[PDB]
Design a protein around this ligand. Structure first.
Ligand SMILES: [Ca+2]
Ligand SMILES: [Ca+2]
Lengths: 141, 61
């Protein structure tokens, strides 16, 4: 079962922190990933969402789409524009999430939650691959 | 009425120009001349990467 996991990080108020999103147990080449990661917008501002180009290929043909227009939600979509030549076929880091911690943020854990209802993983023909998700968190220190 | 499945720019044909609109919309851009009613390609009630992938499949076919 393919697993999409958000990592963990700690940071002081005002610091910029980086959180990896990993895919594991990959076998069938993956042609499509749709995942939504929710965060506490009162504590964190998304600085950027960058793909790991060692694993996510053809980013120059717009294979990696990010949407951060909705407060507290990051939407990430990977699609192989060729349907054959640039699949995700090995485990590794999919992307890095950079957050800026509000200077007035309270100490403690804040969850990074993956929406299981909208999580999609499929092969190059858009056929579903059995998948699961694992949440992460940010710990303000 | 728009009777072409996947014709997001309403020019009669489904090609790479529609894929660009779909990509820009999913990114959150405001796409000039887009037909928002044609975005739910597979008709499952949501507009997401699966619609983009089915659009790419139709264009390749
Ligand atoms: Ca068209
Ligand atoms: Ca749809």
């Amino acid at each position: 079962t393919v697993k999409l996991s958000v990592g963990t990080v700690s940071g002081n108020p005002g610091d910029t922190v980086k959180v990896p999103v990993t895919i594991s147990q990959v076998s069938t080449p993956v042609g499509l990933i749709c995942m939504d990661i929710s965060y506490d917008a009162s504590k964190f501002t998304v600085k950027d969402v960058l793909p790991n180009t060692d694993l996510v290929k053809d980013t120059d043909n717009y294979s990696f789409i990010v949407n951060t227009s909705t407060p507290g939600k990051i939407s990430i979509t990977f699609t192989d524009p060729t349907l054959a030549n640039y699949p995700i076929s090995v485990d590794g880091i999919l992307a890095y999430l950079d957050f800026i911690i509000n200077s007035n943020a309270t100490a403690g854990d804040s969850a990074l939650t993956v929406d299981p209802a909208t999580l999609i993983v499929a092969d190059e023909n858009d056929k579903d691959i059995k998948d699961a998700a694992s949440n992460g968190k940010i710990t303000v220190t | 009425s728009n009777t072409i499945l996947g014709d997001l720019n309403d020019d009669g044909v489904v090609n790479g120009d529609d894929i660009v609109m779909m990509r820009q919309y999913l990114a959150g851009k405001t796409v000039s001349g887009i037909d928002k009613n044609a975005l739910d390609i597979n008709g499952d009630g949501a507009v997401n990467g699966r619609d983009l992938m089915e659009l790419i499949k139709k264009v390749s076919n």
